[PDB]
Ligand SMILES: CO[C@@H](C(=O)NC1Cc2ccccc2C1)[C@H](O)[C@@H](O)[C@H](O)/C=C/C(C)(C)C
């Protein structure tokens with residue numbers, strides 16, 4: 001189709017009052033960035049719940065991706081899943097973000113705002129859902145095809161899923177955190193793709209972005225070694241075209257400047273005593 005432009009947002013969706021809000025709702029910023037990177041066993045138990053719920057909501061929204069649906073509808077479906085399972089949608093009110101997930105079509109790198117945009121045949125759409133429950137967060141995203149997607153776009157989506165999975169498989173106690181982005185970027189560059197730098201994965205736990213940064217490109221200056229009980233996301237955004245990007249007037253939606261398409265996948269991971277566990281499985 002043509003380059004995307006913003007549509008119209010629906011009103012704020014209410015959350016039942018008994019579901020606890022993260023502290024950052026309504027505030028300019030969150031109290032995050034200095035929390036421990038290794039979680040207690042009690043928080044890891046709570047994060048398995050949050051991760052399962054976020055994974056259910058992402059799958060339920062994903063089922064609705066089809067030509068003719070709006071991105072606003074994918075948000076209604078994710079929102080209703082979260083609140084029916086007693087979770088707060090962590091994006092809603094983080095730095096004023098106005099919706100309960102991010103929906104990023106085609107050339108949107110990330111942080112697309114669900115709205116009246118209608119998906120058509122051949123689009124790809126990333127849906128990114130985070131659940132807050134039990135005082136902890138779980139964060140996952142995936143790119144879904146709508147209709148008959150062109151080969152070059154189907155391959156970019158399947159290879160971005162593959163790069164994410166190959167990076168997950170490196171996680172274990174003692175591994176250098178920098179191996180994640182060496183594996184992702186070495187694999188993506190086999191095909192001529194370019195791995196986004198300015199947006200990264202992150203530690204997550206009782207806070208959304210806890211100060212730990214997970215890079216998806218090769219950066220051996222990072223000295224961090226993975227520890228049992230560390231929790232973080234791997235969420236590479238991979239571009240067909242160049243890395244240059246622009247931000248829309250809403251101050252959220254990030255688009256490639258050349259309008260070439262881009263895909264992303266994300267899980268929340270636990271470093272176990274021997275390897276890795278995906279917490280955002282249902
Ligand atoms: C691509 O997006 C990731 C992202 O911006 N990382 C940054 C890594 C990092 C490191 C330190 C501090 C903040 C951050 C955010 C983000 O974590 C998404 O996965 C999340 O679902 C969306 C969150 C909103 C839209 C509410 C922001």
Ligand SMILES: [Mn+2]
Nearest residue numbers: 128139140141
């Ligand atoms: Mn996410």
Ligand SMILES: [Mn+2]
Nearest residue numbers: 139201233235
């Ligand atoms: Mn994330």
